[PDB]
Amino acid sequence: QFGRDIADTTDAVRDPQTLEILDITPCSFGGVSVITPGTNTSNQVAVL
Amino acid sequence: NGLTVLPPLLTDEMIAQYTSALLAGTITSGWTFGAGAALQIPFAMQMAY
Ligand SMILES: *[C@@H]1O[C@H](CO)[C@@H](O)[C@H](O)[C@H]1NC(C)=O
Numbered sequence: 800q801f802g803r804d805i806a807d808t809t810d811a812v813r814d815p816q817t818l819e820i821l822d823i824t825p826c827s828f829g830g831v832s833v834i835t836p837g838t839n840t841s842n843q844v845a846v847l
Numbered sequence: 848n849g850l851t852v853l854p855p856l857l858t859d860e861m862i863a864q865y866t867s868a869l870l871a872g873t874i875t876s877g878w879t880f881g882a883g884a885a886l887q888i889p890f891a892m893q894m895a896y
């Protein structure tokens with residue numbers, strides 16, 4: 800009925816109305832890194 | 848679960864370009880590429896030093 804992650808989060812499910820098997824992938828995330836020269840030099844930045 | 852792995856600064860291809868350059872200097876020039884500009888010397892003579 801469910802599939803499991805190592806932290807005991809859910810990794811997959813069987814749907815209770817259509818018995819198809821669904822993955823759960825977490826909604827896309829990450830670190831935001833702001834590459835900057837000194838604010839003394841410029842207020843322009845780039846984002847990783 | 849909030850965990851991530853960041854990549855190293857040098858790729859393994861860059862690190863192998865450094866071990867390449869360290870090999871190439873060591874063979875062609877002896878210790879001299881550590882002291883300054885790489886002074887070539889024949890390897891048979893470097894091993895005699
Ligand atoms: C949901 O309803 C349909 C009929 O409308 C039925 O075929 C299906 O088996 C039902 N789901 C479950 C879990 O029984």
Ligand SMILES: *[C@@H]1O[C@H](CO)[C@@H](O)[C@H](O)[C@H]1NC(C)=O
Nearest residue numbers: 835836837838839840841842
């Ligand atoms: C910072 O700005 C001052 C403005 O007088 C300038 O003299 C200095 O060279 C700047 N330094 C850098 C690292 O941008």
